Amino acid sequence: MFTEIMRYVLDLGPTVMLPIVVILFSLLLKMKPGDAFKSGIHIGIGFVGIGLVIGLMLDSIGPAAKAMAEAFDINLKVVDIGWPGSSPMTWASQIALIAIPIAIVVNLVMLMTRMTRVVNVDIWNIWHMTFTGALVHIATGSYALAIVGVVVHAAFVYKLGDWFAKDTRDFFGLDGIAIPHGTSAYLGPIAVLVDTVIEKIPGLNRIHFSADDVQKRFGAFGEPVTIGFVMGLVIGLLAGYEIKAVLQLAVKTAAVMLLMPRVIKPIMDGLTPIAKQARSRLQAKFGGQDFLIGLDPALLLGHTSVVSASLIFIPLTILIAVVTPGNQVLPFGDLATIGFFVAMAVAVHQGNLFRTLISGVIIMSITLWIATQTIGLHTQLAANAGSLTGDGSLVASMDQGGSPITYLLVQALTLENVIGLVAIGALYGIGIFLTWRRAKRFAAQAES
Amino acid sequence: MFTEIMRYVLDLGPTVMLPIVVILFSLLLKMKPGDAFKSGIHIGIGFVGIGLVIGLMLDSIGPAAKAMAEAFDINLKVVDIGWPGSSPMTWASQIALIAIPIAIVVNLVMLMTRMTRVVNVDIWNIWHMTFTGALVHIATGSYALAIVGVVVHAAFVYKLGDWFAKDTRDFFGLDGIAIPHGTSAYLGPIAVLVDTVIEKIPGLNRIHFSADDVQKRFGAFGEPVTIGFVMGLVIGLLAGYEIKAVLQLAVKTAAVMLLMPRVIKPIMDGLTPIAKQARSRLQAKFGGQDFLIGLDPALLLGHTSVVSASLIFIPLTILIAVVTPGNQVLPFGDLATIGFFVAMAVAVHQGNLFRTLISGVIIMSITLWIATQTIGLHTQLAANAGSLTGDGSLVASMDQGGSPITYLLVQALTLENVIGLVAIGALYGIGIFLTWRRAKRFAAQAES
Ligand SMILES: CCCCCCCC/C=C/CCCCCCCC(=O)OC[C@H](O)CO
Numbered sequence A, B: 001m002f003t004e005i006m007r008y009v010l011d012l013g014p015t016v017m018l019p020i021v022v023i024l025f026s027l028l029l030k031m032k033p034g035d036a037f038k039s040g041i042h043i044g045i046g047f048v049g050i051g052l053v054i055g056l057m058l059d060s061i062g063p064a065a066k067a068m069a070e071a072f073d074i075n076l077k078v079v080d081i082g083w084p085g086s087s088p089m090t091w092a093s094q095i096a097l098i099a100i101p102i103a104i105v106v107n108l109v110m111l112m113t114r115m116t117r118v119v120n121v122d123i124w125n126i127w128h129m130t131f132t133g134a135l136v137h138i139a140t141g142s143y144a145l146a147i148v149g150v151v152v153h154a155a156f157v158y159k160l161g162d163w164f165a166k167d168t169r170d171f172f173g174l175d176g177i178a179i180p181h182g183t184s185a186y187l188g189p190i191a192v193l194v195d196t197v198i199e200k201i202p203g204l205n206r207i208h209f210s211a212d213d214v215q216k217r218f219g220a221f222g223e224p225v226t227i228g229f230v231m232g233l234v235i236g237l238l239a240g241y242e243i244k245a246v247l248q249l250a251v252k253t254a255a256v257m258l259l260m261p262r263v264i265k266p267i268m269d270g271l272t273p274i275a276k277q278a279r280s281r282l283q284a285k286f287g288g289q290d291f292l293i294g295l296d297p298a299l300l301l302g303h304t305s306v307v308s309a310s311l312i313f314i315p316l317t318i319l320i321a322v323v324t325p326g327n328q329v330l331p332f333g334d335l336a337t338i339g340f341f342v343a344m345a346v347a348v349h350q351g352n353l354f355r356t357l358i359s360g361v362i363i364m365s366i367t368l369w370i371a372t373q374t375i376g377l378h379t380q381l382a383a384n385a386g387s388l389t390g391d392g393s394l395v396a397s398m399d400q401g402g403s404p405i406t407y408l409l410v411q412a413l414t415l416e417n418v419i420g421l422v423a424i425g426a427l428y429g430i431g432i433f434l435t436w437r438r439a440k441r442f443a444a445q446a447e448s
């Protein structure tokens, strides 16, 4: 049955499934069978360690961030269940498994028609696409309309991999990889618009503050490792921790800033020989068609500036929640892994923390406002999974719940908040145009 | 008073309190302030990573071995509760918190009297000493005899660090570091005895099965990361796992071999700048004498040849437990991290798997035999700790329970099985003498 083979492939995990696809690719690409196996284990090993460092972030940064949002007594009554809550509900929609074949077909069609360079292999992040389908399925009522939302969500993020390819390769040091999925990509355009506005404003465009400039004026005390200690200290202190826990947490937050880059190094260390052999062999066929492998947004967290923004924005997002007019959602389950959101924002500004902070507040307010507009739909998906109990408490989430994609699609087929469609649609739509043009120039520069 | 502060120093953690001594010491050495901090934070990030990798061993390789041994639930009816069960029991003894100062004074007395060169800083593996003290206390019934065994265990392990210092540096890369604690060091003298016998036997002294010879024969299939996978497959199958869990475990068992060397490096990199300044200041003052810091035996699992021996010996220790004459103890808790028993054996044989295996079988049979002979005390160690019912189920452990140090101390003061006293003491006694000659020979080879 399709369901068993898909649920066996899904529950096989990136620990097993992705290396096989990596090993199969190199076995046909005339590589020594031993060399083909070596990369497969290293890609899987990195994902094992990736699950470990991410396990540390959500189990020691998370409970402290969750403690801040409660210690700051506000009125926000709806609690951000986070992507750890959104995906279980989403994988409980009827379109959950059927989306994965659909999303590859959209890839395979686009690959033959030279509409995308990304050959996505991460079949586990498709829950973001099912979320767009599930919420459209709730609001419109057409099985087709949910399915088309899967295709639109698939085709968009595929080009989001194309348009952020130099940013992934040159900034994050990921050659041959594109990061299509998750919050980093689909909130990437918003930061491409902020850095487009800022560059054209005099004086503002000359404000800089890169983390290297902290190290150029403080030395050991400006190193990424040191910052992870101090910010962890404050995240504990703002959470009321005793001096024992604040100290213990501050090393764990620092430990992210050293261990996380090291656990992603296995994947790059295994993908490199495969790419060089294939480029030696595919340049002579398709004609200079430099393909991109689609991978989890997790690898992006290997940047000292992304982690710095992540810990920095843990208090900021709670403050963005209060200030943002019309928000009713309290940051929670996505506070620990909140560096996912402002990830490509750092890549666009190329390290300027000044523009990162401006971008982050825009990104958070919008996603906090949008998630407030999707509280009704998000709760039905929770009811449609037996998720929330007899309390009837409202369910909201910042990952996929605060998605411009899932929102803007829903507000198109329903026409509830036309003003909301126009303001969000113009902002996001301009960002997509500016993100698309930024890649046009990049392709004419590298080539000539 | 003392008990509150002792817990506060103890509960603060190896991640928080060790940097404190390290940061204070660099300040004593007039090292830079920011440079003093940086070394301390890296040591914590080293120990954050150690707990994570040692967690994946316990939670994935663990339940794998607990399944294999469950086949023999019917012959061996006493279960090795391992060190994850022996440490909490030992921390509930009356001699627990009083053992920290007693061990430090014994080190201070031995350092001043120029009897040892180990400045132990692991106030956490003092429990191995308390276990020897506590079992003497249950057996003899003398509080004085309990404290003596702690000192004798302290004096032995402090000398163990000096006598196995070349191995911790030439074979493990831990310069200025000694590994006194742990099953590994105190069962190290047995491996020295096996090497002497074999090297005196013709032909058997010329059998080499090293990792480098494994690599040239096989290639990428003899690399450390590949080897952990192949055994990870076997460890899954022997536990009766499905085909997917076999595969998922196998990447994680190979991930151990790659991640663990990279989570101990920050401890090395943080201690290294302090070591050189200490040699600069303290060289002339202390007669040109080189000191060793005493840390955890988990930095020895950063050797890829030890992790291999930790997977190879999961079935063997089990199979040994069936044919060892008089063994009632089923290996269990200590199997997820069985490499902790043969760690210095890997360094004595210079990584020779042929001599590692021949030593490794010897050490397990002795410990399993001794762990059978210490069940009555171990069961009463649990009754006094509150970890017992009315079933009559018996407690045993190869970690500390199978210890020759606890056995020979208990068997010297009680004189129960004088036959067992003579047999274990003679082998251990010849072994310790060989281990002292090793240190005298190496020291005189440094003078030349
Ligand atoms: C730079 C290139 C990209 C630019 C991107 C610009 C985005 C424009 C806005 C989109 C939403 C438009 C909503 C239009 C609504 C039509 C009115 C309608 O249907 O009205 C029904 C309602 O009942 C009446 O009250």
Ligand SMILES: CCCCCCCC/C=C\CCCCCCCC(=O)OC[C@H](O)CO
Residues within 6 Å of the ligand: B143, B144, B145, B147, B148, B151, B152, B155, B156
């Ligand atoms: C290999 C090395 C061999 C030599 C190593 C040296 C061993 C002895 C040294 C110090 C501790 C002496 C014992 C001190 C015990 C004190 C007990 C005590 O104070 O007990 C009073 C109390 O009333 C009871 O309940």
